[PDB]
Amino acid sequence: RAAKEGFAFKHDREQYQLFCDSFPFETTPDQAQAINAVLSDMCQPLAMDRLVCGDVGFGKTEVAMRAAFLAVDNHKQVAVLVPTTLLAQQHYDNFRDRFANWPVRIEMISRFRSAKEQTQILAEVAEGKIDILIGTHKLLQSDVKFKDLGLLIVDEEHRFGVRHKERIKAMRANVDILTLTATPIPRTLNMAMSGMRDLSIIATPPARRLAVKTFVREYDSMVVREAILREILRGGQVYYLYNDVENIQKAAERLAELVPEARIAIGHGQMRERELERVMNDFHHQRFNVLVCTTIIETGIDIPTANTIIIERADHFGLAQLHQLRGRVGRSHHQAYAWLLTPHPKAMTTDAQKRLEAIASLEDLGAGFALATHDLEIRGAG
DNA sequence: TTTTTTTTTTTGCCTCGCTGCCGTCGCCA
DNA sequence: TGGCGACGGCAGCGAGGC
């Protein structure tokens, strides 16, 4: 229940500081309070019931990863459910770069899950020496083996109902979890968790506060070309979204015709994992100045070199797509840009004008949706 | 109180769309 | 010649507004 007594989690502050001093970002007081609360809850023999909210942008995603020191010394396993493969690979790369100079062993599962990869995963879960695990779409239903589960983090529960939460709750044999949603969610679940899980809303906008230009205009090729010319001034990056059903090759050809001075790569979704890895390598090496991603299978996180985000399909929207894209924008120590095209919504044609007026008066997701979430959590929980 | 003021709105939601999976085929021993 | 891994299609998929 609420108590969920655990074991000894001695801090060893000197080694933690020696391992964490290499962080290339000055800690702000609110982040220091957050990490202090996290380490106090870890050392506390009670449940790992801490609620911390962070976005998908860099800086708000590896702050909770400092618990790796507390999860290695006790010699326990931890897991995280990365929804896609590119994000899983980026996370693995930065984790192994940050935690290189000590004998840690980390493996993960991706779209490369052939027979050899499955045998390797079976061997690693039979050994148990592996510290950190990263899952995929089919992680929940798969029989994942754990001998000593330290903690676990899982988010992005918008593309499906409440089934994975209870499935992972059925996997809580003498272990605790730190499940939290990065994207905003209705606060009824937060109120239900309240009274057992401590509420810690650090809410740090600063330490990366730069100018952000977000606008919206009518569909037009000239404005898109002007934005491309503005962003290619320092090797920036934009993203173009598509239904991934029609001729994405023709869309890319049209983009190349619009800007022949740039080099557009292949940003087609649902392709081979090898091609996805090549696309990630191209993004890391900045070989192609222009590269686009269409859906959640492709758009999972923002790139620090990226500076402009453009949305073209304002007539057909996705309930989960909007939530995913409302958390994947940011930049460090540079100006940020954003624009949106406004095609006329058409469908049953009964309320096309009403839909257009609503899009014009969108008011940033109904103005204060946080107020509505608070008003719902006050009224009820769960 | 029609589907929306996209919201103090309950169990209704239709809608094109994501996907685990099963069968089939090329390949290697 | 047989077993295997990659590939393609399809009906199920929590229970979810335009």
Author numbering: 575 to 956
From the reporting publication:
To further understand how Mfd binds template strand overhang–containing DNA, we visualized Mfd bound to the dye-labeled smFRET substrate by cryo-EM. Full-length Mfd bound to the 5′ tailed substrate in the presence of transition-state analog ADP-AlFx was subjected to single particle cryo-EM analysis and a ∼5.2 Å resolution map was obtained (real resolution ∼8 Å). In addition the reconstruction could accommodate 18 bp of dsDNA and 11 nt of the 5′ dT (template strand) overhang. The cryo-EM map reconstructed here suggests the dsDNA on the upstream side of the motor domains and the placement of the motor domains with respect to dsDNA to be consistent with previously reported complexes. However, EM density for residues 917 onward, containing the TRG motif, appeared to be absent from the side of domains 5 and 6, and the EM density of the DNA as it passes from the upstream to the downstream side becomes inconsistent with dsDNA. Using molecular dynamics flexible fitting to equilibrate the structure in density suggests that the TRG motif has dropped into the path of the dsDNA (yellow ribbon), resulting in the partial melting of the duplex with only 13 residues remaining double stranded. The motif forms an arch that interacts with the template DNA. The conformation of domains 5 and 6 suggested here may represent a mode of engagement whereby Mfd grabs and stabilizes the template DNA in the upstream edge of the transcription bubble, supporting the inferences drawn from the biophysical investigations. Additionally, the model suggests that Mfd partially melts about five nucleotides of the dsDNA near the junction forming a ‘TRCF bubble’.
The transcription-repair coupling factor (TRCF) recognizes paused/stalled RNAPs and either rescues transcription or initiates transcription termination. The bacterial TRCF – Mfd is a multi-domain adaptor protein consisting of seven domains connected by flexible linkers. Domains 5 and 6 together form the motor domain, representing a (helicase) superfamily II ATPase that exhibits structural homology to the RecG translocase. Further, biophysical studies revealed that the motor domain of Mfd binds and partially melts DNA containing a template strand overhang.
